[PDB]
Each structure stands twice: as C-alpha cells, then as structure tokens.
Design an enzyme around this catalytic site. Structure first.
Site, short mmCIF file in Angstrom:
data_model
loop_
_atom_site.label_atom_id
_atom_site.label_comp_id
_atom_site.label_asym_id
_atom_site.label_seq_id
_atom_site.Cartn_x
_atom_site.Cartn_y
_atom_site.Cartn_z
N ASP A 148 38.90 25.23 78.01
CA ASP A 148 39.78 24.63 79.02
C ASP A 148 39.10 24.47 80.38
OD1 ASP A 148 42.43 24.38 80.72
OD2 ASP A 148 43.07 24.33 78.62
N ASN A 180 51.40 15.67 74.77
CA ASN A 180 52.58 15.61 75.60
C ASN A 180 53.14 14.19 75.69
OD1 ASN A 180 52.29 18.38 75.99
ND2 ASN A 180 51.35 18.17 78.02
N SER A 191 50.21 22.38 75.88
CA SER A 191 49.13 23.26 76.30
C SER A 191 49.59 24.71 76.42
CB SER A 191 48.59 22.81 77.65
OG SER A 191 47.95 21.55 77.55
#
Length: 279
Positions: A39, A161, A224
């Site tokens: 990340d 998303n 996430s």
C-alpha cells in the site's frame, strides 16, 4: 479473549449477528504469522503496532506513509486496538505514492518482491499479503497476484469501490486470490462495493475505525478496509493451524456467515468473514 468496545468490524467478524460491540478471538492472535500490507506504507512508529510493524520495501523517495491509507489497513490487520490478528508481524511494501496512486508495473514489482522476501523472514505460521488496491483489468497484474498466491502467500485483494462487477478490475478479478467485497454495520452491501462472481467473501468495509498517520486514528470506508479484515483473519486462522496460505480463502468461505447480507446481486456470494471462535 475478548476486546470490549471493539470497532464494529472487529466485532462483526467474531459474531453471527450484526450490532455487537465485542471482538472474540483466540489469544494466539496471529503470533508467528506475517501479513505484508502492500500500500502507501505503514507508520510503523504508531504505538498501536507495538514494534510489530516494519517497512521492508518502497519504490518512492520515502518509505513513510504520507497518506494514512496503508497505515489504516495495517491497523485493521494487526494493530492492538483495531486489528484482527493482534500478535501478527506487519511488513510494509509501499507501492502507492502519498496520493494512493501507483503504476501497475510498480504494484507487480511489489508483489514479486513479497513472494521472495517472505523467505528472508521468520513466519512459521505462514504468510499473508493484503492488497487494498486496484484499477482496470490487467492480466499482468492478475498473473502477479496469482504468482504471489502460488508462491505460498495468502493474497486478499479489494473487490473495488465502483459498485460494478469486479470482473473489470485487477487484481480483484484474479480467480486464485481472495477477492474481498465490503459491507456496512447493518450487514448491507456497502453502497460502493464491487460485486460479481469473482468475489470470494465480504468483510466489514463502511466506517472502519483504524490507525492513521501522525499517530492518530480515523474511520474511513472502502473495500480497502474489508480486505485487511480478511487478511488479518487469514493470518489468525493460519497461526491456529486451521488453514494454510493456499487454502485460507476457501476456508474463510466455508466457515463464513452465509446469506446474512442485503443488496447482494444475483451471482455474487453472500458470505461474511467470520472467525468462528468458541471460548
């Protein structure tokens, strides 16, 4: 063990009914396992990590988390207050810049890095990788997540998303890795969460309180946030001997609360990550 007033997502994965406030878990808490958070980095200094987090790779001028996103996810994997596996070891691979962007080539590099770097680390209970990231379909990216998986790591990825089918997203659409949709505190599908047959499991994802850069904490929403729940769960179950890196996503789906989610479209699984802990 019981964590009173735990974040709702933690409580959810330990429960059969939404709305509860305690997270129940074996005290091994992922001791002996390793979750690579791939990340924006991890603020390894955050007291929530207890020196169990450490950055191991970056592709940018700094390995610091100038964003908070990666810190938010590692907090959901392994932080003391906010994580599922509270004794796990957290490795930061920073493939995202401080705007949460990264190039596919860099992401791939980061995945290939993890497949090798786990051999430098002592993880006798196994290895998990958490990928709260994605974008358009790329088979190169999918192949990379598959290799990471095949290399002996449990790969949990966000479904996306877009409130669309995860078919058109990567690494979300790679069959051999655990692809994670997001739900809210009311067992609804999160308004944003991607869906489709390529999902394997849902995790808590809307209003997820967790560590943030600057030693702070905050609640954000996304697939996430669901991903690291399943990542932490994976590592927790591997420490407990209940599954292996290669089998964990299937195990989590076997042992998941079935049929409890609303607004799941036809064709998308209705499975909510669940630790099945019995005190």
């Amino acid at each position: 063990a019981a964590q009173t007033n735990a974040p709702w997502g933690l409580a959810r994965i330990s429960s059969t009914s939404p709305g509860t406030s305690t997270y129940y878990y074996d005290e091994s808490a992922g001791q002996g396992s390793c979750v690579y958070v791939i990340d924006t980095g991890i603020e390894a200094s955050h007291p929530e990590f207890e020196g169990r987090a450490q950055m191991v790779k970056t592709y940018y001028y700094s390995s610091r988390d100038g964003n908070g996103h990666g810190t938010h996810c590692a907090g959901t994997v392994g932080s003391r207050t906010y994580g599922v596996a509270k004794k796990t070891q957290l490795f930061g691979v920073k493939v995202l810049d401080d705007n949460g962007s990264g190039q596919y080539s860099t992401i791939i590099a980061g995945m290939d890095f993890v497949a090798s770097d786990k051999n430098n680390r002592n993880c006798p209970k196994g290895v998990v990788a958490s990928l709260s990231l994605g974008g358009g379909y790329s088979s190169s990216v999918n192949s990379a997540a598959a290799r990471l998986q095949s290399s002996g790591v449990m790969v949990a990825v966000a479904a996306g998303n877009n409130n669309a089918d995860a078919r058109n997203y990567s690494p979300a659409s790679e069959p051999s890795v655990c692809t994670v949709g997001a739900s809210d505190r009311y067992d609804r599908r999160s308004s944003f969460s991607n869906y489709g047959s390529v999902l394997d499991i849902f995790g808590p994802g809307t209003d997820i309180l967790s560590t943030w850069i600057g030693g702070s904490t905050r609640s954000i929403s996304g697939t996430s946030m669901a991903t690291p729940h399943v990542a932490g769960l994976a590592a927790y179950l591997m420490t407990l001997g209940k599954t292996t890196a290669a089998s964990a996503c299937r195990y989590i789906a076997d042992t998941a609360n079935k049929g409890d989610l609303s607004n799941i479209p036809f064709g998308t699984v209705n499975l909510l990550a669940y630790n099945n802990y019995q005190a």
